[PDB]
Every structure is written in structure tokens, then in C-alpha cells.
Amino acid sequence: NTLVNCIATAPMKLSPAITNDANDFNASSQQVYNRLVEFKAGKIEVEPGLAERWEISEDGLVYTFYLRQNVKFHSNKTFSPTRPLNADDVVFSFQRQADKNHPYHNVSAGTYFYFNWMNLPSILKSVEKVDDYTVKITLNKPNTPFITTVAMDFLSIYSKEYADQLLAQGKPETLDQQPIGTGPFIFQTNQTDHAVRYTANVDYWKGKADIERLIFSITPDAGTRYAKLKAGECDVIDFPNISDIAQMKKDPQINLLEREGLNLAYIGLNTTKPELNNVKVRQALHHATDKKAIVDAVYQGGGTVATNPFPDAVLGYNPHLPQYEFNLEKAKALLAEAGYPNGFETEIWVQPVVRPSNPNPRRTAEIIQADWAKIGVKAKLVTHEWADFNKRTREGEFAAGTYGWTSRNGDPDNFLFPLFSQANIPGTNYSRWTDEKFEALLASAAQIQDTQTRAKLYQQAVEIFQQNSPIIPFAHSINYVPLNKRVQGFVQNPFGYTAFYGVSLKL
């Protein structure tokens, strides 16, 4: 049994702690490593990983992880472990990142993109060994999403024994280039070009994987990946051309899996601009945003109309959030009501660098421009280079624009706080909107543990946001995993990653 995974580009880094491109994770953390807790398959909730169990103190400040016993690291021709995983390995993995003086902190000229993106420098107070099987993590303030952060790829647990050996041997770089973990697959040290090869770990604590060998074959052309998948020369492909999706849905040889991405494409509105400061005007522009047309024209099937600022996989989703239905007549009337019988002139900043959240900002902008014009809003499309687009948006120069956001941990806090907190102006809160009650709900919700209590708080916060319409959500992208019919037991991951543990091959 050999699964062939055909990927578009060669993975740059085989070390999750120092990876920028989330696609590298599929070649390392996803097969070779484990985390303290792991996301349940297909879900955003966590379950025990290298921690067999954990406790959180009353105040939400202290996380205590009790480590699974008799977990072995892999070996290669350079390294054979003499002890099982313990707290030293966990402390090493966190501290390499958090402690600038740590001996491995600059190994590989490494940059801890995710540690910083998830705000651990400010959230994390300390990571301490209590005993060999107990790790105590203390936060600077309570943060419920932290438990899900711990399950993210960048917090994969490395072997300190291996790291100690390599430092002693004068080649610490090897830690990042020849990965050793506790995970379900072992990185084959003998490697060829245009491919990454793995073998099943017989000693894996969850039980040995069904598939004995994994080949990641670099196959740069989308059309070729598709062709080979039909041919059974690939079992899985990535970055399928959207043009091919419709026919893939008809192909007997293909099992096309799909689900909404944890992202949002929206029209941002600068609520400090004279006309856009007016809530009724914003509601009017919202009524004059043809979301179905946009999704239809722009995503060519690979997207869904957004009703909430996050998809229904996210905690707090509200299936009956009131909508500003597309109605130009109502839009123009609202504009008159707001004191603008002849509308006004404005700008729509077009995003110049395509992202998965929105594969065609230019066409998005054009559709909106045409409808807005019909209600007397004359919006010129404005082009900028990537860096300018971003910097002058953060600084509040824009009026309207085509923007997107992707959540990395999938928690409602990691949509609503970045987008709408006062603290993120100037910053990720492009619209500059704030509301005292809304901000209090976000803080309470981020600092409360109970799931259903959080969900109600988020639903309340989102209703306030919706009433004020500071941005106009229009789409979530759809992620696709095209599989050959032979592969069984693969579960699509909300974050987009591909894990092959638990997967089996027919025929």
C-alpha cells in the first residue's frame, strides 16, 4: 500500500516551528510530528495528543498538561533515542521560539512566523517542567482560544535528545532538515529529487497506520495533476484548477471532497469617511451588493455566499442573522433617508494580489461599481501596489475596498477581534468601527471557558456588528481535496491540511 500525493510545489521547509507557508506543514507536522492536543478529524475542537489529559485553572491562566507515557521518537541512521518523550522535549519546542537567547532560536536562521501571528509573545507568560510528565503553561491573561493554538502545526513537539546531540555534533540545522518526531509517518532519510518519501511508524502510540509508504510527488502543472488522478497515477492532488472542478464532480475515478474555508471575503468600508460614517449609508451599500452575482462570477463554483462573518463550522455561527437583501430600490431609498438624494462619489480599492479568499477582486469591484452607480453612488476603481494597498488601508486612506481574512485557529475570537477590535486600529480592523458593548462581549467571550456560554456571547456580538454593517461580508471560499476512488477514510481538515493517518487504499 503506497499512497501517491501529487503536489504543485516542493516544500521549502520540513520544520513546522519555522514555516511561513502553511503548505509545508503537510510534508512535516501533519505526518511526522504530534502536538500536545490535536484537532478531532474534520473539526475545530481538540482531543488528547501527546498530553493524555489537561486541566485549566479557574481563572483560565494556568494550563497543566499531563504527558502520555512510553511515546517514542523515530530514529534514523544519525539518531536513536534512549528515552521516551517527556517534558524536556515540550519545553524545548516552546522555548526555542519564545526565548530569544535559546541556543536553537537562530538555528536555520529560523523565523517564528506562527508564534508571532498567534500573539504568543504577549499571551504566553511561561512554559515550565513540573516533573518529567507534567508541563505547566501560564498565560499573561485568560485566553480560551489558547487550547486550540496548542494544536496548531507550529507547536509540534521536537526531540530535545536529538537536538542536544546535533548541537554537540556541530550540526543543529539537521533538526530542521531531517525531521524526527513521534508521528504516524517516518521521513525516509534516503530521498530523491522531485519527491518526498515516508514510511509508516510501527511504534505509533495510536497504532500503526494502514498505509505503509507515502510518496509526495512534485507535479507542477494543474492539468497534469488532474489527468494523472483520473489515471490513478496520483491518489491525491492539490491546487486543482477551478476550471476542472465541474468535470471532476462527474468523473467516476474521482471522489471530490469540499467544504468552506475558514475565511471571509468582504467589502471593507472606512467608517471615518464622511458619508461612510453614516450607518444608513453603509446599510444602503450593503443592500446594493449583489452577493450571489459576485460569488457566481468570481468563484466559478468554488465559493459560497456569506451570511455571517465566519462559516457555519465556527463557534457562534447564527443561521438566522438578519440580512440586508439585495434590493437597489430599497438601497436608493435608504440613501435618501440618510440625507443623500443624489448619492455621492467614492472609491473602491481593488486588491492587486490574488488570495484564495478572493480569486478575482477586480471583477468583484466591477460588479459592485455597476450596482452602486445605479443608486447614485459613483465609485471609481482604484489600483495600488500590494504594499501601498495594505499600508494606506491600515492608515485609513481608503473609502471602500475588496479585502479578505483567514482565521488560523478557526475560533470566532480569531475572526471578530482582528477585524473589529478597537485595539486593531490602525491595523487589521480596516473599517475602524468600534462599539463599547461589542468590545466588552469579545473580551468576556475570549476569557470564558464554557462553550455554549461563549457561543451566545458571540451571537450577541455578531448581531451588533450586523446592525452597524461596518464591512459587507459576501463570500467564503470552498476548499477542495480531489481524491482517487481507491483512497478511503480521508477526512477533510477545516484548516486545509492533509493527514494520511487513518487512510487506507482499496484494490
Author numbering: 8 to 514
From the reporting publication:
Based on sequence homology analyses, the bacterial SBP superfamily has been classified into 8 clusters, with cluster 5 comprising dipeptide binders (DppA family), oligopeptide binders (OppA family) and nickel specific SBP's (NikA family). Apart from GbpA and/or DppA representatives, some Pasteurellaceae also carry the genetic information for a close, although phylogenetically distinct homolog, which we have termed HbpA2 in the present paper. Interestingly, the HbpA2 clade diverged significantly from both the GbpA and DppA signature sequences. Because we were unable to identify a molecular interaction partner for these paralogous HbpA2 proteins, their in vivo role will have to await further study.
Indeed, our thermofluor analyses showed that none of the two HbpA2 proteins under study were able to interact with any of the tested type 5 SBP superfamily allocrites. The crystal structure of HbpA2Hp was determined to 2.0 Å resolution by maximum-likelihood molecular replacement. The structure reveals the two-lobe α/β-fold architecture and β-strand topology typical for SBP-like proteins, and is essentially identical to that of the structurally characterized GbpA and DppA proteins. Crystallographic refinement and exhaustive examination of residual difference electron density maps failed to provide any evidence for a bound ligand to HbpA2. Moreover, the N- and C-terminal domains were opened by about 33 degrees with respect to the GSSG-bound GbpA and glycylleucine-bound DppA reported previously, again indicating we crystallized apo-HbpA2Hp. Importantly, the crystal structure of HbpA2Hp offers an explanation for its inability to bind peptide-like ligands. Out of the 13 GSSG-contacting residues, 3 were not strictly conserved in HbpA2Hp, i.e. A380P, S430T, and D432R. Our structural analysis offers direct evidence that the A380P, S430T, and D432R substitutions would be grossly incompatible with GSH and GSSG binding as they would abolish electrostatic, H-bonding and hydrophobic interactions contributions critical for binding of such ligands. A similar analysis, this time against E. coli DppA, shows that R415 in HbpA2Hp takes the exact same position as the active site residue D408 in E. coli DppA, a residue that makes a salt-bridge with the amino-terminus of the bound dipeptide ligand. Thus, R415 would prevent dipeptide ligand binding.
